[model samples]
Target chain A: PQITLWQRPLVTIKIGGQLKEALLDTGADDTVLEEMSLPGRWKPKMAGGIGGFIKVRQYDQILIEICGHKAIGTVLVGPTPVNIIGRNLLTQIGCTLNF
Target chain B: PQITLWQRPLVTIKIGGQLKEALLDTGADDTVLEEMSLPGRWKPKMAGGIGGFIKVRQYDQILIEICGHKAIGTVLVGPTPVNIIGRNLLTQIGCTLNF
Candidate 1:
């Protein structure tokens, strides 16, 4: 699949059976979602970005579907201003930066 | 040019005749740099992201070189935690998201 870099690369994704929109952030190392509850044990972790660091719940082995591409990996749930689909899941889908 | 999404998509960039490293942030709408003095007139603006919003100086007609690809556009200068190359300049270089 090919996507133009016209705007923020936002895409609809399905995670834990719920649909949500997330930014395809190649700059982020991990996938972070807006605060939510998931069925599983998780560890508390911290993530940093443009402004500062954020506390998150690291849930492992979670299934996520982005643009019909299926991926399973660790997902961080936290009080993020926006949902970010980072490299962890993007690599699984063979995402690449091109020109 | 083609780059893999193995880690944060950071690449060396040349701005204001100095080289710096900046993240290829597909999520960011405008290119932002750490506080610096450039030879140009700018307007005050605000930009928001994961952590929060920030005050920035919008400089027009700035030249940037990313991975040897030349681009000229609006660049925001401010106290950013990290340097980010956003869609505004990425589009000028014909950047795209692919899988």
Candidate 2:
């Protein structure tokens, strides 16, 4: 799938049996999800944020279905304005940038 | 050019007669460059950041040579940790996300 940058590169992703819109962010090194309760143990983690670094809950081995493709990776639950699908999972689905 | 996610997607871009590496960030709505002086007039603007919105200088109609392509758009000069080529310039250079 080739996605144009004419608008926000948003795609519907299925995570933890829930479907949600997420931005495909190549600039981010990790995937960040909004605050949610997942059925697992998460350790305290800090990620770069708007002010400084923000503490977040990191869940590993999470299954996510991105646009019909399945991928498993570390998903961070934090206080972010939106859900971001970063390079961590993008690589699992063989995503890339092209011209 | 097809850039994989195996590493940071840094590409060398020519801006203001200077060559520098920039990240192709689809998640960012605007292009943000590190602090630099260009021959033009700019207005104050606020953009996304870790703490909150950060102040940046918005220079319009800036010519940037991306890869082997040329584009002109609003280039924001600010104190970003790294230079980013966002959707604004990516569209002009026909950049897209693919899988």
Candidate 3:
């Protein structure tokens, strides 16, 4: 018998008081911030990547509760359209993805 | 019965000809480049993020094959300790995590 993979609503985070809905992708290892869209007090830290090396910064994890669920993880402040919930953070919430 | 999650070996790209071992993290939405570590041609693009609006850029995806496994995805040019694998790329391999 084939088991069905469970999918859940991606958590939405309030940025500047705006709620951004996102999927909790455990396949990801850590939280990522939208590039060039980070808030103040969050400085861009220099880092390396596939294209090459550049600057990225760390920021406080936003506390969110979704469908009787909640999570806290570090967000890499950057310029992008959405936020991602990685594996380490997901483990903290006692949840797993079956997809 | 609890099924064991199949964990696969993360791919490593030859940076400057050096194979950098990395974990496949689907939690990360996109690939990141090390600040000041990225190669030339990838100019930073300004965008919005959790920290605020910042600069980011896209790069070519690295092709990696692991123990009967292979994946190709784009990496964000940034600086960090390790290369991250986000869900956008993980799903391509038809794999999941159990942790």
Candidate 4:
């Protein structure tokens, strides 16, 4: 599927049997989601963006279903304005930027 | 052209008759560039990201050539880690996310 930039490139993702919406962010280095509770122990992490840097928790080996495709990678739980699917997981699911 | 996420989706952009590298960032709402001179009266503005909000200067009607595609829109000058081509100009260049 190809999603144009006319609107936010929001996609449905299933993680931990939960369905959530996230933006396909090519700018972000890690996948950051809104604060969520998961089983694995998370380590303190920091992520940078247009504004600046934010404190976050990094959880590895997290399985996620993006647009019906299965993927597993690091998932960062943090105080983000919205859930974002960054390049880390995007590569696992074979996402690309097309023009 | 389709660009895989295996590497940073860096593209060359011609802005103000200068060529520079930038990332295709779908997560960003507006285009932001590092401190540079542009011909326009700008107003104080602020933008948010994974971290927090930062003060910036907003300049409208900025002409930029992205990968040979021409676009005119508002551009923000701030302390960005990297130059980002956000949805504002991405849409003008007919960019999209595909899997």
Tens digits of per-residue lDDT, candidate 3, B2-49, equal 212133335554443345665554445555545435444554565332
Estimate, for each residue in B11-89, the C-alpha lDDT of model 1 and write its tens digit.
9999998999999978778899998869987899988776667889999989999999999999999879889999999
Report the error of model 2 at residue B43, Å.
Answer: 0.6
TM-score for chain A, prediction 3: 0.57
Q: Candidate 3 on A1-99: residue-level lDDT in tens?
A: 121222333555555445566555544445554553544466556533333443558766655443345666566654434556555455666654333
lDDT by residue for model 4 (A1-99), tens: 988888888889998778999998898778999987777887998887766777889999999999988899999988888999989999988888888
Clashing residue pairs in candidate 1 are none
B38-77 in candidate 4: lDDT tens per residue?
7769999998866677788999999999988899999998
DockQ of each: 0.76, 0.75, 0.13, 0.83
The most accurate candidate by DockQ is 4
Q: Model-by-model lDDT, in order? A: 0.88, 0.88, 0.49, 0.88
In candidate 1, position A2 carries an lDDT of: 84
- Standalone chain B TM-score for every prediction: 0.94, 0.94, 0.54, 0.96
RMSD of each: 1.4, 1.2, 8.6, 1.1
Clashes of each: 0, 7, 66, 0
Better of 1 and 2 by TM-score: 2
CA error at residue A52 for candidate 2, angstroms: 2.8
Q: Rank the candidates by DockQ, best first.
A: 4, 1, 2, 3
> Residue B45, candidate 1: how far off, in angstroms?
2.0
Which lDDT value does model 3 have at B78? 48
Q: What local lDDT does model 4 show for residue B29?
A: 82
Residue lDDT tens for model 2, A1-99: 999999999999998878899999998899998887688988998888433677789999999999999999999998888789989999999998988
Give the CAPRI rating of model 2: medium
